[PDB]
UniProtKB/Swiss-Prot annotation, chain B:
Protein name (record): Glutamate receptor ionotropic, NMDA 1
Main function: Component of N-methyl-D-aspartate (NMDA) receptors (NMDARs) that function as heterotetrameric, ligand-gated cation channels with high calcium permeability and voltage-dependent block by Mg(2+). NMDARs participate in synaptic plasticity for learning and memory formation by contributing to the long-term potentiation (LTP). Channel activation requires binding of the neurotransmitter L-glutamate to the GluN2 subunit, glycine or D-serine binding to the GluN1 subunit, plus membrane depolarization to eliminate channel inhibition by Mg(2+).
Oligomer status and interactors: Heterotetramer; the NMDAR subunits are modular and harbor tiered domains that function in concert to regulate opening and closing of the cation-selective ion channel pore. Forms heterotetrameric channels composed of two GluN1/zeta subunits (GRIN1), and two identical GluN2/epsilon subunits (GRIN2A, GRIN2B, GRIN2C or GRIN2D) or GluN3 subunits (GRIN3A or GRIN3B) (in vitro). Can also form heterotetrameric channels that contain at least two GluN1 subunits and at least two different GluN2 subunits (or a combination of one GluN2 and one GluN3 subunits) (in vitro).
Family note: Belongs to the glutamate-gated ion channel (TC 1.A.10.1) family. NR1/GRIN1 subfamily.
Domain of life of the native organism: Eukaryota
Covered residues, full protein: 738 to 838 of 938
Organism: Rattus norvegicus (Rat)
Glycosylation site positions: Q34
Domain notes: A hydrophobic region that gives rise to the prediction of a transmembrane span does not cross the membrane, but is part of a discontinuously helical region that dips into the membrane and is probably part of the pore and of the selectivity filter.
Subcellular location: Cell membrane; Postsynaptic cell membrane; Synaptic cell membrane; Postsynaptic density membrane
Swiss-Prot record, chain E:
Residue window of the full protein shown: 559 to 656 of 1482
Record protein name field: Glutamate receptor ionotropic, NMDA 2B
Gene coding for it: Grin2b
Function: Component of N-methyl-D-aspartate (NMDA) receptors (NMDARs) that function as heterotetrameric, ligand-gated cation channels with high calcium permeability and voltage-dependent block by Mg(2+). Participates in synaptic plasticity for learning and memory formation by contributing to the long-term depression (LTD) of hippocampus membrane currents. Channel activation requires binding of the neurotransmitter L-glutamate to the GluN2 subunit, glycine or D-serine binding to the GluN1 subunit, plus membrane depolarization to eliminate channel inhibition by Mg(2+).
Residues of the site described as Functional determinant of NMDA receptors: N41
Subunit composition and interactions: Heterotetramer. Forms heterotetrameric channels composed of two GluN1/zeta subunits (GRIN1), and two identical GluN2/epsilon subunits (GRIN2A, GRIN2B, GRIN2C or GRIN2D) or GluN3 subunits (GRIN3A or GRIN3B) (in vitro). Can also form heterotetrameric channels that contain at least two GluN1 subunits and at least two different GluN2 subunits (or a combination of one GluN2 and one GluN3 subunits) (in vitro). In vivo, the subunit composition may depend on the expression levels of the different subunits. Found in a complex with GRIN1, GRIN3A and PPP2CB. Found in a complex with GRIN1 and GRIN3B.
Span list, region Pore-forming: 30-49
Stretches buried in the membrane, not crossing it: 30-49
Family per record: Belongs to the glutamate-gated ion channel (TC 1.A.10.1) family. NR2B/GRIN2B subfamily.
Amino acid sequence: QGLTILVKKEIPRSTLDSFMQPFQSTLWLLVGLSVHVVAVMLYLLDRFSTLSSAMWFSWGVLLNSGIGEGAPRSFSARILGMVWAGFAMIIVASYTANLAAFLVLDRPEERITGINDPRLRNPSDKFIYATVKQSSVDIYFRRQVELSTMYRHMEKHNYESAAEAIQAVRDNKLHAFIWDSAVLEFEASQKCDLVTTGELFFRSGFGIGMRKDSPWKQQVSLSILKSHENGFMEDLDKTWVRYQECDSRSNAPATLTCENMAGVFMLVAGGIVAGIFLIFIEIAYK
Amino acid sequence: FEASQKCDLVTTGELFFRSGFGIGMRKDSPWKQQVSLSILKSHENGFMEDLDKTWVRYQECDSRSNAPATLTCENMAGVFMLVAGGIVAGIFLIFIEIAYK
Amino acid sequence: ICTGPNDTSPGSPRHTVPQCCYGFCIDLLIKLARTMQFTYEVHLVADGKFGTQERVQNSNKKEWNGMMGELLSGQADMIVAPLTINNERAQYIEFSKPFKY
Amino acid sequence: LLWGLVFNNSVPVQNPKGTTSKIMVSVWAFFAVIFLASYTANLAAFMIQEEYVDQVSGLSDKKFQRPNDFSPPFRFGTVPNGSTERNIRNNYAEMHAYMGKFNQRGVDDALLSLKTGKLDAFIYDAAVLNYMAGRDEGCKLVTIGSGKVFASTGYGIAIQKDSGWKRQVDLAILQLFGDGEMEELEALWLTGICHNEKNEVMSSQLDIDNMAGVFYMLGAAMALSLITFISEHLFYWQ
Amino acid sequence: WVMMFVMLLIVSAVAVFVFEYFSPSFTIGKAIWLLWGLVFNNSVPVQNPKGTTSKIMVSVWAFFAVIFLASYTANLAAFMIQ
Amino acid sequence: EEAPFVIVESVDPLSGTCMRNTVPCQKRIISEEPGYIKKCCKGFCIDILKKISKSVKFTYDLYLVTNGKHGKKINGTWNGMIGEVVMKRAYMAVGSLTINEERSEVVDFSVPFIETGISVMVSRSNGTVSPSAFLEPFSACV
Ligand SMILES: *[C@@H]1O[C@H](CO)[C@@H](O[C@@H]2O[C@H](CO)[C@@H](O)[C@H](O)[C@H]2NC(C)=O)[C@H](O)[C@H]1NC(C)=O
Ligand SMILES: N[C@@H](Cc1cc(-c2ccc(Cl)cc2Cl)cc(CP(=O)(O)O)c1O)C(=O)O
Ligand SMILES: O=C(Nc1ccccc1)N[C@H]1C[C@H](C(=O)O)Nc2cc(Cl)cc(Cl)c21
Ligand SMILES: *[C@@H]1O[C@H](CO)[C@@H](O)[C@H](O)[C@H]1NC(C)=O
């Protein structure tokens, strides 16, 4: 028997607030200026050796639509147009590359690794972890001399039970819980949503006790050795503590979802409703 | 020093084995006390720092971290080799098509 | 200006010849001489080893060859060099305060 | 046409009606898609931004004695009444007069004002730092390399003026060093842990106009256009 | 994976009438084809709605398309890490 | 008493002794003049003191300080541990005691066992991309 740390297995969930996130809220204001600049510049440098034409030409070649027909005929305009196409490709490439660089590095925080975690050795109010008040572990940590600050931390959050600890762990009011190996492994395999981790640092074995002079100790030890040999103890193990078997492999990366990038089709619906207003004005004008 | 000199090798690690250098004499020189006093004076008034700056930490080829690699002239050379092969195959292609047509 | 060992005189493995001897440790030496009034004559003589406790041809087995030899057996009276601090060496020698970690 | 191919479908363009040219443009397009994919991949490889430039520095550096020489100057201070005060006020002192605006009411205040950008460098004892820098929680802050220290002395222990018995404790301590126990004792009391885990990696959420260069090159072509616009006179005088 | 399909048809119907009022016929038939070509990748010669306002609708659709495709390829490069 | 070297907390609540502190250190006080309390005094310098007194055979009894912080000169008089040693009211000074010139001229000193001095501290800045990144992913060949 040793000791281990029980934590809640955080289900993966991507943190992407909006599609606009990978750019500053000021680049978007610069691209429009640039496109209209190139538009009017094209309109000028053609017939000096159609406005809507060149305007749509730019707005298309950036937006990668197919709509539009205007082909610059001057020798001036062609160069500017081609380099503008270049600029367009490079903007979109930068955008997608940055977004991928943001998503790759969004694997959730790694869980604690045993007892030598910086996240555990240097306590903070950002990561709360405690154990049962007045138990053998709080005793073992009072008695400990290598580290005491952790003790200080776990002095303020101790729960006076086991069930309350388990609950608060399922309710995220407590990020970690230190305890015995046997109880924890079973409690994890049972509920199938919490996970143990660490390595058994404190070590011991359980045993059966008698007075110092019973006439029986020798036969008892012999019987227990027989049991360990002929597989009986293994069968009891299999039957009683390692049975339920909710084991699994590692996790998968997160999946952006119904609200993760919800803003974009909200935008397109707003585009439809704006078009509703656009048709009415244009027809009367024309 | 050997690193700051040639500027293409780098040191690393942390000083595990520890000690200090020192000046030695017999066990009964009449001088040890004045020598230790002089060395402390030197450590205080910056003299030792100046010798340091002059003799071992001078050349100063330090730099920041590195940048990721850059695929280059031969890294992806095969593709335009392919396109040139396409041109030479087209040379073969035009001759046959015209005669056929 | 300090005299030299054999191999600095390449002809014979025995004779010696002066050389220009020059470094910052020498600068510390000169500083000391200025503040601790004395003259000096430096000689770069050894076999080429600092000379920790070696063995013998099985006669006495306590030698302190090399630089410690020159210090203990009356050859010299001071050692200015990158000499470490080692409690073995602290048995027979007297060290100054540390001046470089 | 080929420019439109390689970069991105831009505009109505004529297509070579030949029965074999189409082959040439097709393989060109193959080259194009491979090219663009490779490019965007490697650029996503660049934008990864290792964490610690760490801003190395010396000790008798112009980065200190000439603060106003730089873009907005350093904000580096000390604790006033202590010892290091006097230890510097007797070698340069012109730094000293400059650093008066940055006193710190203690130590924890100094670290706090260090995390939140109010300061950018701290100058103080060596050992107190090398203890503190290895204890605080995030430890996104680190001392400079322990090879460039200004006035290197040592915590030791005292004894009566006459040699009662000094050489005894002297050899004892040197034996302690030689056997390798100071290291263990430090590891048990002094160092702490987060000295390793050198540098993380971060995303940085590209928002700066670092594409300024990009923009600039755009503008460049604009000017070239006007240069070639000059051709409108190189017909008028023709 | 289904909103876009619904967000596809709903837009297309708006074409069949927004075109009808302003000024080879962009019916529901060709229109669906067009938007599919938009979202995934430029495929083939397709008719373009000659209206002075539909073009606005297809344009914003194209904006949606480029953002969509970029997001998709990014997250897939996120998956393939093993 | 100092933060990371020499700690001073209390006696044990059950028996008043110490568990592994191993030193009573006789926390005297003047407020005649008695030595009031004996509190446990653990830390780092205390550890090295124990480790060394093991080898060189002697015994000891730590003695707290009352006059000054560490030691300074006032009217040609030494106030602090250095005072406590310059007159033989004790025999050895332990703890966070720095070596300088004038002290080493009045008192003696062992070999230093912790190196120290004046140093600096930075904040480990973040670091952004080059403004000329866009052109990075292809050498001048391609
Ligand atoms: C360096 O580290 C990160 C880079 O991602 C920045 O962190 C956030 O910074 C703000 C400060 O405005 C904090 O309130 C947040 O808690 C930090 N984390 C997150 C997840 O937002 C940090 O600001 C960067 N340093 C500077 C000077 O910008
Ligand atoms: N020990 C030094 C005195 C001395 C001690 C400290 C100090 C303070 C808190 C802690 Cl926890 C540890 C230490 Cl070492 C700091 C300084 C520096 P300053 O006083 O300028 O603030 C100092 O001088 C001596 O022997 O004179
Ligand atoms: O902590 C306690 N009791 C306690 C309960 C509530 C409050 C305070 C203390 N018991 C520990 C140690 C206990 C023993 O005899 O060593 N047996 C034992 C066996 C298992 Cl399986 C797990 C543990 Cl933690 C324990
Ligand atoms: C430190 O020096 C300042 C100088 O103004 C003084 O006001 C203060 O009393 C001194 N002591 C402390 C503990 O700050």
